[PDB]
Design a protein around this ligand. Sequence first.
Ligand SMILES: CNc1cc(F)cc2cc(C(=O)N3CCc4ccc(C(=O)NCCn5cccc5)cc4C3)[nH]c12
Ligand SMILES: [Ca+2]
Ligand SMILES: [Ca+2]
Ligand SMILES: [Ca+2]
Ligand SMILES: [Zn+2]
Ligand SMILES: [Zn+2]
Length: 229
Amino acid sequence: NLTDRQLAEEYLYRYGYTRVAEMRGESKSLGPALLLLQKQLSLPETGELDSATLKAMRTPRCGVPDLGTFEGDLKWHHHNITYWIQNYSEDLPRAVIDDAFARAFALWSAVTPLTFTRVYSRDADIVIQFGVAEHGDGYPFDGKDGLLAHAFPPGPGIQGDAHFDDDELWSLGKGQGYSLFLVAAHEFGHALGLDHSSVPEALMYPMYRFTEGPPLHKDDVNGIRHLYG
Ligand SMILES: CNc1cc(F)cc2cc(C(=O)N3CCc4ccc(C(=O)NCCn5cccc5)cc4C3)[nH]c12
Ligand SMILES: [Ca+2]
Ligand SMILES: [Ca+2]
Ligand SMILES: [Ca+2]
Ligand SMILES: [Zn+2]
Ligand SMILES: [Zn+2]
């Protein structure tokens, strides 16, 4: 497999840190990219490929980049957001999957002027899809672990849609597998127009953190408030 050095390089590149360090003239060596990463994930800012940074880079996370072309202003311009569960993972019963997504939407519904209504139609605002490797959007998944899912900011077509890597074991996060409820709640955050948070305890923190407690943090609620009047 990849050397620690190579895993680091791929991570800094994939999540947009390499590009930002290039724009500041300092791509020659990893130090500057690592500091942007340590800042962005609230790690001690050593600028070293240290134990906390390598730990972080090995942590399963969202496939959405942390730093940086879509159409429109990346918020919804209607109250009633529709979602269509285009397909299913075989990892869970369909009713449990449907309920995991309903629960992810009820989380945001309480703190936004938006409503979420399940439909069965191609034209839903938020199309939910399970897929593996290349799955039709040219942002291919990476097999088991690493990237768990991604989503697209509000707007037309693929915009607002949420995809889940079916090379992961989907569960409710108890015993084996990733909580589909917690990953969906995070990705639906992007589907409403939220960026990653730097607050480790926040839902919109990019790394997967299993919890049984209520997942929204002040920072998530406030991010939504700074988006929707
Ligand atoms: C595979 N999916 C995918 C590929 C890609 F190349 C870009 C994006 C962006 C998203 C996304 O929907 N969101 C939700 C909406 C939003 C809105 C703004 C920003 C953003 O500002 N990024 C720049 C860095 N940011 C960090 C703190 C302040 C600036 C990011 C995001 C992230 N999904 C993406
Ligand atoms: Ca994966
Ligand atoms: Ca859409
Ligand atoms: Ca699976
Ligand atoms: Zn994310
Ligand atoms: Zn996708």
